[PDB]
Amino acid sequence: APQQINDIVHRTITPLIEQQKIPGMAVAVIYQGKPYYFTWGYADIAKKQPVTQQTLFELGSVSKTFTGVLGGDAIARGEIKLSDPTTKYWPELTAKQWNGITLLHLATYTAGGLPLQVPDEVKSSSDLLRFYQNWQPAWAPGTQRLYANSSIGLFGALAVKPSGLSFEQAMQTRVFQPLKLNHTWINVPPAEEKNYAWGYREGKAVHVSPGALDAEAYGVKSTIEDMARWVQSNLKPLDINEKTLQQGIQLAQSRYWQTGDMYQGLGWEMLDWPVNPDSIINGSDNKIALAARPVKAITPPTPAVRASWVHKTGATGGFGSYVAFIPEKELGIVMLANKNYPNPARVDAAWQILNALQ
Ligand SMILES: *[B]([O])([O])[C][N]S(=O)(=O)C1=[C][C]=C(C2=NN=N[N]2)N=[C]1
Known part of the structure; x- marks a missing residue:
């Protein structure tokens, strides 16, 4: 790889790994549109399996970018409109607080205080309807942003209804397949299990647990190669041959709301470049x-x-996980790790790398 990339990546990530005690990590830098890959450490400590370019990591809420693009694609297909009431796609949602809450509000966390997590007690479809029917907004629609799996996850589930497809089938056929993300999964198949890293929490090997709206909000697993290709696709949607998918990518990067210096897209979040690094670094802290x-x-x-x-x-x-890119510079980074370490450390490392390369 070009020495400049090698040097800034290693000089930034090596100390990060040491400071944060990250067991395994993969990084891709996209530079002038081309990917360069780096790996460190272990996918499975007990079995001494190294991180490779084929290792699957849990993306967590980076999944929301796939959900937002899949929703954008559904808008481009004419299947839904963001201006549609939530009740158009879920008529059983008859409680009056849903009046005026649109798909846009769900997609962008602005429905009025839907909670971060769907309660673990919600196990059945009827439990999920009860939950939304009984939910009481703190705020009028379109007035406050509260980041929430229960908001964008419901958006993803409703967005695919007119298609008649399951969420997973829709994601596979409309997003993963056309983009050649052939090692990206909502459910890891048995054939791929040898590549699925363990996550580490307090020293214990863990994988994500099933939950309501998991696929839609936090349930994608992918490799560093596929994630590099996801960044490439979002950097340059005009190269995507499938018309509605190209359009969906563009819709997911539109700016719908502003809070502080940040703009809310569909899944993606955006700031003007050049950015104040303290603003994205500090802003990333939960x-x-x-x-x-x-x-x-x-x-x-x-x-x-x-x-x-x-x-x-x-x-x-x-x-x-963390993904960031700057379309005007054809520049991006993906950082995947099998420990949940603090957001600002991710963004600081990403900014150091991208700033040096821009
Ligand atoms: B996203 O910002 O990554 C969502 N974060 S979250 O705090 O809501 C969350 C949801 C599920 C899980 C999970 N870990 N293992 N099983 N479920 N963790 C965080």
Whole structure:
């Protein structure tokens, strides 16, 4: 690889791994559109399996970028509109608080205080309907952002209803397959289990647990190669041959709401480039990222801005992921680790690498 990339990646990631005690890590840098890969450590400590370019990591909430693009693709297909009431696709949602809550609100965490997590007690479909029927908003729709699996996860489930496909089938046929993400999974098949890293939480090997709306909110697993290809696809949607998927990618990077210096897309979040690094670094800390914040509507949404830092953090109990890219520079990074280590350390490392290469 070019020495500049080798040097800034190793000089940034080596200390990160040591400071954070990360058992295994994979990184891809996309530079002038081409990927360069780096790996360290162990996918499975007990079995002494190294991280490789074929290792599967849990993406956690980086999955929301796939959900947002799949929803964008459904909009481009004419199957749904973000202006549609949630009740168009779920007529059983008859409780009055749902009046005026649209798919846009669900997609962008602005419905009025849907919670981060669906309760673990929700195990059945009827439990899930009860949960949404009984939920009471703290705020009018379109006034406050509260990051939430229960919001964008319901968006993903409703977005695929007109297609008649399951969420997984829709994601496979409409997103994974056309983009040649052939080692990206909502459910890891038995044939791929040899590549599935263990996550590590307090020293214990763990994988993500089943939950309501898991696939839609936090349930994708992928390799560093496929994630590099996901970044390439989001960097340059105009190269994507499938028209609705190209359009869906563009829709997911539109700017729908502003809070502080950040703009909410569908799954993706964006800031103007050049960014103040303290603003994305500090902004990534869950003390800010998970907080309830007033939003300003962008009326109408701004189309995808090329001069953007576009990014998403993700975590499960055992894994920590981060993706960021700048379309105008054809530059991006993916960092996948099998420990959930603090967001700001991820973003700091990503910014150091990308800033040096820009
Ligand atoms: B995303 O920002 O990564 C979602 N984060 S989360 O705190 O809501 C979350 C959901 C599920 C899990 C999980 N780990 N193992 N099983 N489930 N972890 C975090």
